[model samples]
Target chain A: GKPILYSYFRSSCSWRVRIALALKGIDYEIVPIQVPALKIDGITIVQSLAIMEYLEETRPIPRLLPQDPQKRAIVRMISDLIASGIQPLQNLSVLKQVGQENQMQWAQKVITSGFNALEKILQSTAGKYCVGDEVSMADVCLVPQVANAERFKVDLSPYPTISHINKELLALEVFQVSHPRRQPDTPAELR
Target chain B: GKPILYSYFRSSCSWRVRIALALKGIDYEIVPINGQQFTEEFQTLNPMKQVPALKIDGITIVQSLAIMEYLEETRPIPRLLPQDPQKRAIVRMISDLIASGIQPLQNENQMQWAQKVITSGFNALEKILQSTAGKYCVGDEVSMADVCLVPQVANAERFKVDLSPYPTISHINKELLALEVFQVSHPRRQPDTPAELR
Candidate 1:
């Protein structure tokens, strides 16, 4: 059974779904909304975290969450740090409120402030992937965000560990295939 | 070895952890971060400098929901999440709807802007709760969704979003607050709660 993803390439949230689905080896159909919803099973899933959870829990072959409770906590923590604390502030809805003049700087500051703390956390926890060598949900979150950091022109020099981890993740086929640039709906010129 | 919770009395994020610890009956120490937030000592303690950075198992865990997940996993007696996968996803959805979708929008600034975002999120939250809620946020076991629910409603109260439209949110929140878990971990009941707030 193929699940449908309402995907927007530029969206870090949507891209994480692409990464998670690919990481698990679950074949899914993309609606390619560079432009879009996930219609899976009889029920349609909402929210990126929830969608990832549904995929992880239902298809546990390649686990997005680790077996250990503590490791699992670290993955979820890093994911939340990005999903809630960082991405929300710089999102399109939020940027409109920031006003046109301050949007870029505001988005950059939001990414920088979040990355500053995240870099330190990763220095302690990172091993090849965001938490360890394994590709957990944290990496699912971290990779798309690094792309966002690049888009926001956030200085990654301050966070060498994040850059290193992101580079490692980007080398993966899942992340490469799910990248915003290569998506079906990705702006033709951008591709 | 007792775990230590870095808590701020008024913080909704901190309050979520307090309730989680209480629900699990996990005896833990509380280090209130009321004024020490800007200090180097606090930053050294938690790189994020956010309250609810639980010191447990000889390491620190930040993010309120992250701490809760650790508790639910390490101490499985009282499950904060459900056993069923779809149900669990629903709980996470409701939780994220507040944690990310609603709570973050509340203060990214401007009261008028906050109101619109809160109202919009509640529109989704209430509709979802209609099918999923029963006594508590997810069929009455008092899952993680309920853990996140009461605190965000507190934020709504502060923002003065009318509760009439979302009967489900208001009702479930009322059901949640009636529990002793909610009472003890309330923002008003924390160690760092100011005299003025008390």
Candidate 2:
């Protein structure tokens, strides 16, 4: 039996989980949810971050978070960058209101600034992957964030270290197979 | 001479540094720069992370505002965050808004999104700003709440939150920004370190 994913096509949150599952070679069914059409109806999972954490606990393999106390907190910091930081700002709810004209500018500002911070930290500590040469939880988190940056059109020239890690992650079949566009909801006709 | 922090006078982001430094009493040097008018120079120490990273014991610890809290625990003086589990979680919740919530949204790249897709995000932020406003976001007393609130509220004002209705936020910001510690450690006061050195 395959675990089911409830997600929207463009959702960075869902994209993250999809990548994780693929990387772990876990078999799961995909259930696409529209951004504006949530049928949660008291089934809960109010916060996206909470939902991601829930998924991790439900059928976690190749653990997405570190077991060590201090290390867990550190990884939480990076996770928070997406879950709490970028997600809240670019959430479907937020994007709906910030409007068409200002959306791109706003998206770029947040992504570029975020990448700037992300790059330094990644550069400072990274070796082969985000967490000092290990393909730990950090890579899982970093992949989705960099994808968001690229989608937003943030310049990568200033972020070589981050881009380098992004390049490596993108080349993997795991990252490639789980992209938002790969979701069934995205119409083949549209592509 | 120890490393000098280039910071703004009233910016809340910079206040994190002031509170952290005071908590640890990490004596160094202080340089105040006007962030509003002055083109920032320190693009290397933090890059888009902006000011408040410290140079201590010949190493720089960036991000995770609680770097100071760790130092406080290591050095042991006046603790910034409490030791109790629940209390500490509360402190983290308060800190999360600025660190994770507001800061990322307000990033240099995210500014573009303001014109499209989601404009109400700003309104949502305003709503939280109103709901969360207190003597600080958490409650009375300085705590980590002030450290986070002080900088973000300043940005809120710059974005034009309409000071007429947000009296509580306006008032609290005034109070927090008035402190000598805030005054001395503001971003407007500590100019960004030059990119060359970084």
Candidate 3:
């Protein structure tokens, strides 16, 4: 049976799981929920990292986590860097609560700060992907965040390593299919 | 050799790792570095320049959850995650609820907005834990859920959010607070804690 992903098209967290699913060739139906949630095997799951981990554990083919514990930690670190560090700070709810006056500025500031750190990490860790030549979980996190940074007008020029890896990730069909604009709920204009 | 934890006494994220280490009984040294996180040397340790970067087994790990997961992998005796995937997902969800949902909002400069986010997060967490919790989050075991929850509860108290409304959270928080692991790793007990703050 296919899993049902309760997701928002523009949500970066949702995008991470979608990329993972696509990479693994697992069939999943998108439910377009306001928040990033997923219903799989009759259990409704929330939180992008949790959902991704569930999928990783349940479906181990084409592993998202690296084999080595240290490498896996690095992958999780990069994912956490975005999941907890950037996305939470600049998500729609946070920005909405930040109010219209400073919302744009808030988004720009947090994204810039996060990207600065991410770029530095990527310089040493990145290969053809975020961790190594393989498209690990870090790449799953990296692509969607790059999309968000671009959406928030975070300049990518400073982080050559991040931009280079993001370019490579975007070229992959998995990332392409899971893009925000490609989702079922994406606005027609945005599509 | 024991690990070296780069941490700040008051940081909720740092406390999460500290709790895990204490629970695992892994001896570690704390290198207090707060604002110094931005320095080049510290950045080498953690590109994110965040508190709770850990150096162990000759490798430096960043992100509190990642460090906890690494510990869980290497030291499996006192498991922070359950064996079941579904149950583990719920525990991870609770952790994420606090880490991303509540903690980040509180870190922002806007106190009023931060308070609102805390309330929203606790409301969701309390409702979820009602079914999932028993003596601890996820049926009596002190899993990663508790590690994430205790620190967030401290932050909630700091923000002066009323814990009275969330009976389940308050109950679990109380039980966790009574535990030796949580008590020892608390912010006030850390070596670098300011005397006045302690």
Candidate 4:
């Protein structure tokens, strides 16, 4: 059965899963939810982290997690650092809660704080990607978050490691094709 | 060598790791980092400048859930995850609800925003827990869900978000708190915790 992905075009969380699906060469149809959920294997999964793990468990080809437990932990650490640490704080709903005037300030603060940490992690962890040369879950998560940072106009110049890896990730067919602009719900001009 | 946990007494994220270490029956030393987290020296330990960075098996790991997952992998006794993938996913979702959905809003420091996030998250959690919770979240045994639930519930109380409306959460939290692991790892009981907070 084809898995159904419920995601918004600009959702960094959804982008994490989209990159993984593309990397693993799994076929999934997009359902486009405002909150970014997924309905797969006759079950509806909310929480992007849960969805990503569910996909990894159900379909193991081109593994999203590393084989070593220690490396796998590092992969999850980077993923959570972005998924839970950065994206949630700057979510559309959360920003709307902050009021329009201060939204960008909130976004920039969260992204910069997150990226500051991420850049440090990548300095030691990066080979060609986040956590190693292979595309682990960390890379899947990093690209979308870096994209979100760009959307909010947070300066990328400070984080050379992040920008460097993000550029490499963006060049990959999986990340390029899975871009938010390429999604079905993306606005025409953006597409 | 005992694992060293860099933690803060009041940090909900740190509480998650504390509970896991206690539950796993692992002996660990706590190095309490207050505002010292932002220090250049501390940044070398964790660039995120976050509490609950753990050093174990000769590698330092950050992110509370990631640390918990590492603990789960190394110390599988009294497993923190269910064997079934579906059940594990549900546990992770509940944990994520608090970690991603609730905790971040609290960190932002707006009372109204924090309260709203708590209400929205607790409302969702109360409903989901009705179906999934038993003696603990997901089943009769404590899993990662319970580890996350206790800390978030504690923070909810501190934020004065009413828990009376969510009977399921209150009920499960009561059971979890009674456990020796949760009791000993509690924020109020940790070393360096101020008298007022304790």
Fraction of native contacts under 8 Å reproduced by each candidate:
0.81, 0.19, 0.87, 0.78
What lDDT tens digits, residue by residue, belong to model 4 across residues B11-81?
Answer: 99999999999888999998888655436545663776678888889888889989998999899977888
Task: List, residue by residue over A16-77, the lDDT tens digit for candidate 1.
Answer: 98888888887888886411257777787788888888888888968899898888888999
Candidate 4, position B12, lDDT: 92
Local lDDT at B195 for model 3: 98
Docking class of 3: high
Residue runs of model 4 more than 4 Å from their true location after superposition: B35-41
Residue-level lDDT tens digits of model 3 in A25-76: 9888888853678878779888888888888999897888988999999999
Model 1, range B1-198, lDDT digits (tens) per residue?
898787888788889999999999988888887545435545653576687678888877888878888888888868889998878888988898889888876654477887888899889888888898888888978899999989999988988889999999999899989999899899888778888987
**For residues A62-107, could you state the per-residue lDDT of candidate 2 as single tens digits?**
6665554344444554565556555566655566666886887877
The clash numbers for all candidates, in the given order, read 2, 59, 0, 0
TM-score of chain B of each: 0.92, 0.64, 0.93, 0.93
Q: Kindly give the stretch of ten consecutive residues in candidate 4 chain B with the minimal lDDT sum.
A: B36-45
Clashing pairs in 1: A6-A37, A33-A36
> What order do you get sorting by TM-score, best first?
3, 4, 1, 2
Clashing pairs in 3: none
Q: Tell me how many residue pairs clash in candidate 4.
A: 0
Identify the superior model by DockQ, candidate 3 or candidate 4: 3
**Where's the lowest-lDDT run of ten residues in candidate 2 chain B?**
B114-123
Error of 1 at A21 (Å): 0.4
